[PDB]
Design a protein around this ligand. Structure first.
Ligand SMILES: CCOc1ccc(C(C)=O)cc1Nc1cc(C(=O)OC)cc(C(=O)OC)c1
Length: 119
């Protein structure tokens, strides 16, 4: 333990992929988040005028799958970035905003004990 703590990609995937899978299993709530927002195809062309750092579940999954995170908190940051983009762009009356609120509740439930045990 008198060593710099390193999280190998496989350790991050084993600990963190279950928390991402818990989001994917929310149907329909994860549906708006499973792929990058395409503003033209979705009919929301000003999206990138508001959301400067887009994020979605498939991008997070690819980063875990390819070892692009060095520390667990970087994964957690990307999940919150995805949620905060949706709460910034969508109105409280919209289904996407309500779905985002549900996903964030699920994430908070799953992530806290996982981060505690990761150390
Ligand atoms: C039409 C407005 O779409 C959006 C608006 C905003 C955002 C964000 C992340 O700020 C994302 C979407 N995209 C999206 C929405 C829904 C949906 O409302 O399902 C009930 C389903 C899918 C999908 O591919 O389901 C397979 C994709």
């Amino acid at each position: 333990s008198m060593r710099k703590k390193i999280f190998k990609p496989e350790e991050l995937r084993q600990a963190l992929m279950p928390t991402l899978e818990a989001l994917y299993r929310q149907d329909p709530e994860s549906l708006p988040f499973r792929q990058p927002v395409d503003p033209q195809l979705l009919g929301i062309p000003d999206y990138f005028d508001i959301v400067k750092n887009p994020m979605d579940l498939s991008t997070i999954k690819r980063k875990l799958d390819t070892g692009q995170y060095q520390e667990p908190w970087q994964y957690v940051d990307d999940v919150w970035l995805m949620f905060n983009n949706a709460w910034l762009y969508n109105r409280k009356t919209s289904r996407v905003y309500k779905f985002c609120s549900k996903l964030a509740e699920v994430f908070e439930q799953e992530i806290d004990p996982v981060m505690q045990s990761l150390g």
